[PDB]
Design an enzyme around this catalytic site. Structure first.
Site, PDB file in Angstrom:
ATOM      1  N   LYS A  72      12.222   4.618  -6.871  1.00  0.00           N
ATOM      2  CA  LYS A  72      13.065   3.410  -6.779  1.00  0.00           C
ATOM      3  C   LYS A  72      12.235   2.146  -6.927  1.00  0.00           C
ATOM      4  O   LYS A  72      11.258   1.964  -6.217  1.00  0.00           O
ATOM      5  CB  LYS A  72      13.810   3.406  -5.433  1.00  0.00           C
ATOM      6  CG  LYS A  72      14.320   2.070  -4.929  1.00  0.00           C
ATOM      7  CD  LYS A  72      15.694   1.693  -5.420  1.00  0.00           C
ATOM      8  CE  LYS A  72      16.033   0.497  -4.473  1.00  0.00           C
ATOM      9  NZ  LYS A  72      16.107   0.659  -2.949  1.00  0.00           N
ATOM     10  N   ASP A  82      24.980   2.526  -0.130  1.00  0.00           N
ATOM     11  CA  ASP A  82      23.927   1.665   0.395  1.00  0.00           C
ATOM     12  C   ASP A  82      24.062   1.538   1.901  1.00  0.00           C
ATOM     13  O   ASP A  82      24.319   0.468   2.436  1.00  0.00           O
ATOM     14  CB  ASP A  82      23.933   0.305  -0.287  1.00  0.00           C
ATOM     15  CG  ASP A  82      22.593  -0.423  -0.167  1.00  0.00           C
ATOM     16  OD1 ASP A  82      21.756  -0.078   0.682  1.00  0.00           O
ATOM     17  OD2 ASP A  82      22.389  -1.369  -0.937  1.00  0.00           O
TER      18      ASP A  82
END
Lengths: 433, 435, 436, 146
Positions: C202, C334
């Site tokens: 990421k 998220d």
């Protein structure tokens, strides 16, 4: 005045070429002065000889091109013992290992991770005995590469083996070296040369085990590998690359590596490339055979290992068949079972006993490129690294597995094993008096 | 089933006591099962013995109580080599040294600065052979003490050997340890115990040479020395103190040190104190004799006169201590495989010991050098460890016999034969440990 | 030595990618799905060998969330300071509850994109705790002054904790965040995550959604760094997921070779086409936008709040447009493990305009695309795929909010093992205390 | 070189991780173990545990049960350090629990003011009386032995 030795041999195996019956070899000081038939010994040597020997079989001293000078304590079972073992402990153990190697007729070793440079100093000043050591110093690895100790946190590993943060404590002189990026890999190679490394070793793919890193995936970027090869080359070293998967094999070849280890997924394309570019194949079949004997491990991990063992076998056989230049390496500690590798060259690879001997003698110095003297062959002008055997190894390659069958060992013209010769070689004196 | 060996001896020198003619010794496994006359061997051993030997002379394996497991490269001529030499080089060299020691009948060594703890591991796992090693780990020194490397700047030395700033790179495990103050010195001792040290060594005065530090002046404060002794004592170690000048000798005694080395300015007061408190005297006369043989070449004339003055004091101190009945053990101050046998010669020819007393100082008394860490050893006596050597010649008739390794025909350590007729370089039933 | 066989009969079977089947059956053999199809067609060998049978109204693949963060933070600091200050032992403990809760809600896979997923997965894989399959990025990678930076702390503290220079004791290189600047450092940054077992990488490729410190409209990292990061991941068969809002960041991430994009708030026609062309996954994380929209400019300057609404609107159009254009989508929330992940399915339908069946596809069949070549065959009820299977009491195609009641998930199989079901304890079938 | 030390690791790694010098990033001072040498360092050692919310203080006051590295018969820490540790705990209303096997360690822990003893393997008549007199808790941990 020159020290001259005549050795008469029932059978003389020169290393590269047809064996000679009823032959003779003359040693003058450190080099071989004559090889040929008994009848043809130049008369000047018949007059000047200090001593003569008569042996059934004579051949070059043996090489192993994949050793590791670790000397680890037996406490940790992974690479943690490399870090945790005090190098004084290691050196002591490596001294025994080196003694044992020489008693078995191994007069040269290529160390590919460990303290070979540091131990060679104790061989070269005559405090101990052993083979000629050509050491890589530390194996070079990326973070999360095959040299990394995954079970330890990263700060401990890179504090120990990284090329940043110079500090007291023999910084830059361990069995492994972690470097990331073009800048760091330059220092990495240089730090090995600094210790006297005569070869450079990189981890160019994952480890055979497949738990942490993956043998199928390449390691280091092509940019780093190229810089590593260029660094080595500027000081007349070649690079040896640990490779299993084809990705890693091809990246190592592209970068300019001149020796490949394991080479488990070598196929037709690889063999041709290695022939084309003059790249040495060192199978280390011993290490595969050990875990095959273990027979497991999770059932899927074991199946993975067997699949790799099969590919490795095909790759080795194919390379032999295709005429790739091969040398022998065991991937073991000094004084380890190196002789088994000759057995596997014949019984797994499909070499003749004579080809197997070639791979362990005449071809072997290719493992260290331009750092090799003229050696590995019983030839005029070559170094007097010579061993005598009681029996003909061409009739049984397993003969090498009995150290008693090696009756005489010359290294650099000096007799380190032979009838009447003590443990530390001819005219040994206690160096501490 | 126990492994039993009978050794018949023309002369048996027990270590502490009158030698015995036509004697026998029985080894059962690691210990001595019987000592006495040939005629008195218990019949059970006559029946159960795996092997028998017959030798002219039998005695305990020899100790040297002042060795240093350095293994240095030959490049730097001072203590710089201890720092610069990679310990892998050192270990390799020490392996030869240890082999040589054992071949000369030395079955125990007290290492007082170096890698004895680390090398002992390779002996104890059977990779190499050597004596029992009782190591101090690093010698402890103050900054600007005898352990300091004065030719190097101070940051380099204390970065390498100090007890602050833990870091990668075998921190706390070198031949030397610099510590200043009560706080640091606690760690200093503990770091040696950490390595397996079976004794603690301090520098309690200047070095014999007199160029940087001064042998006449004491080193460490009394506060530090007391703490060092207390730290050692809590783990059943005693402290050995390098001392020349009387100031250093007295400070070491006051602090509680139980072994003193060199002791060059020991006088009547020192001898009495050492007797009273049971403190071992290790002269290391060999080291003095080496520089006397050198003859002050490459030294200033006044520096050479200073050395001779010290050599004379050292001689008087040694002779006086022998005469006063101070308990003595032998140490050479040399690398493993060094000329340790010479120290026996000097015990007789310089100190004035009888050959029998010299042997006692190298056998029966020697384990006192490591205090409570000593097993029952150093004597040919029932229940003691089977560290036993055989000789071709009677050393009581000529103490120099020990200087010919061929004269030591048999060497048992812990009941195992490491040297003897038909026995290979690595001892009986040796196998390549790497197979 | 015998294979363990389970037959599950389903009133309705939602395969994940394909038309649902009525009156169907699924067979599990050990870890894998051995058969899917109509009840009448079950191979007789399984009818003979089955250890147990179940009958449920609805069967479907176990759910994925492709945007989780394994933080476990103490509730003390309100910004990223808690990530630094929270002792990871506290975190792990909290994450254990989170993982338990996830699995009880039918979530059998999670993609962790910043935190201790790699470290916690070890406790799941040795059976000490229970949870989804965790595919973790290890630390999110950020430049100095990037979205991963803790701006309220001085820079030496943040780079001492998370930088890739100065190795030291104290679990160096193993936090929720990794700061790296320049090609050299970013190589190590990626490698340090692989070191911990990361199955994805990421990066922060633009500013954060709150336009306070860094700016969501501006790209982060150079193209040179991003390319190296992608190459490093690729060599170990990982793909890179990129946090992107502004188009500058979106385009730089695409050019560099990133294969998954998060938020993607300013995706327009050009972006959708590129993502289709290059096979790049779209993960909207609409939940996070919806949270602050519900806040209603709560202690925000009026202009800061207007900025947030503008971004929320763009984000909505981008998402709807990508769905309409046929970009491959997966769902991410998220949030922390055990968070309100089911809401994201609701938003896929009610904001994105997906059918319930498409929403389920985005949370099942498409979801493993989130980890590229690290994905097994999973996320579908298909022969040869992994037996990650959940049963429901009601038909989610009639109401996507059904997933928001955990009681409605009656059965949970992960790798063929039943972790929730009638008669099954909190730690799953045949659980035993691992500390005895 | 005490019972909390990890002898198989080199000393710099262990003291880098668990020592009370060299503050640094990485949850310094918050591990399972704390190495401290001398009165000065042991003060910080105790304080670092109180910092985390410790409601008791634990010391290694003798060697470990396995007689491999350190020796269970020998005391650990100096009496000076142990007294300071007890005083540091006491100021924040904590007591100290002492890992003790050999009598040397048991007696040093008692003298210093420890109020709970663990294992207590060589407790004899003298120890029992002292523990009664001073109100010291006996925690045998017989499970470990078994």
């Amino acid at each position: 005045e020159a020290k001259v030795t005549i050795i008469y041999a029932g059978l003389l195996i020169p290393g590269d070429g047809e064996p000679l019956r009823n032959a003779a070899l003359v040693i003058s000081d450190k080099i071989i002065a004559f090889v040929g038939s008994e009848a043809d010994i130049p008369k000047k040597y018949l007059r000047s000889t200090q001593s003569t020997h008569r042996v059934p079989v004579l051949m070059p001293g043996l090489w192993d091109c994949h050793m590791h000078f670790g000397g680890d304590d037996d406490y940790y079972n992974d690479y943690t013992s490399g870090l945790a073992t005090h190098p004084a402990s290691s050196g002591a153990r490596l001294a025994r290992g080196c003694w044992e190697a020489l008693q078995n007729g191994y007069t040269s070793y290529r160390d590919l991770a460990g303290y070979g440079c540091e131990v060679a100093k104790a061989i070269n000043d005559g405090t101990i005995v052993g083979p000629n050591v050509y050491s890589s110093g530390a194996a070079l690895s990326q973070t999360a590469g095959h040299g990394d100790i995954f079970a330890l946190p990263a700060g401990e590993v890179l504090g120990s083996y990284g090329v940043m943060n110079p500090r007291p404590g023999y910084w830059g002189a361990g069995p492994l070296c972690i470097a990331d990026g073009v800048e760091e890999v330059r220092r990495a190679v240089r730090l090995q040369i600094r210790r006297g490394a005569k070869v450079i070793k990189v981890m160019a793919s994952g480890g055979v085990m497949s738990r942490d890193d993956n043998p199928n995936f390449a390691q280091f970027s092509p940019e780093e590998l190229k810089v590593i090869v260029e660094e080595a080359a500027r000081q007349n070293r070649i690079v040896s690359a640990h490779v299993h998967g084809k990705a890693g094999i091809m990246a190592a070849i592209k970068a300019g590596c001149k020796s490949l280890e394991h080479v488990s997924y070598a196929d037709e394309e690889v063999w041709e490339l290695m022939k084309e570019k003059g790249i040495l194949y060192v199978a280390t079949r011993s290490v595969i055979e050990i875990f095959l004997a273990s027979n497991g491990l999770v059932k899927e991990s074991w199946a993975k290992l067997q699949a790799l063992a099969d590919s490795h076998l095909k790759a080795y056989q194919g390379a032999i068949k295709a005429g790739v230049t091969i040398a022998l390496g065991t991937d073991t500690a000094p004084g380890g079972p190196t002789a088994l590798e000759l057995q596997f060259a014949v019984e797994r690879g499909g070499m003749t006993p004579l080809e197997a001997i070639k791979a362990a003698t005449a071809n072997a110095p290719l493992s260290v490129g331009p750092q090799a003297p003229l050696t590995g062959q019983l030839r005029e002008g070559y170094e007097a690294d010579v061993i005598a055997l009681e029996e003909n190894p061409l009739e049984d390659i397993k003969v090498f597995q009995e150290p008693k069958a090696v009756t005489h060992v010359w290294k650099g013209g000096k007799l380190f094993k032979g009838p009447g010769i003590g443990p530390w070689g001819e005219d040994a004196r206690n160096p501490f008096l």
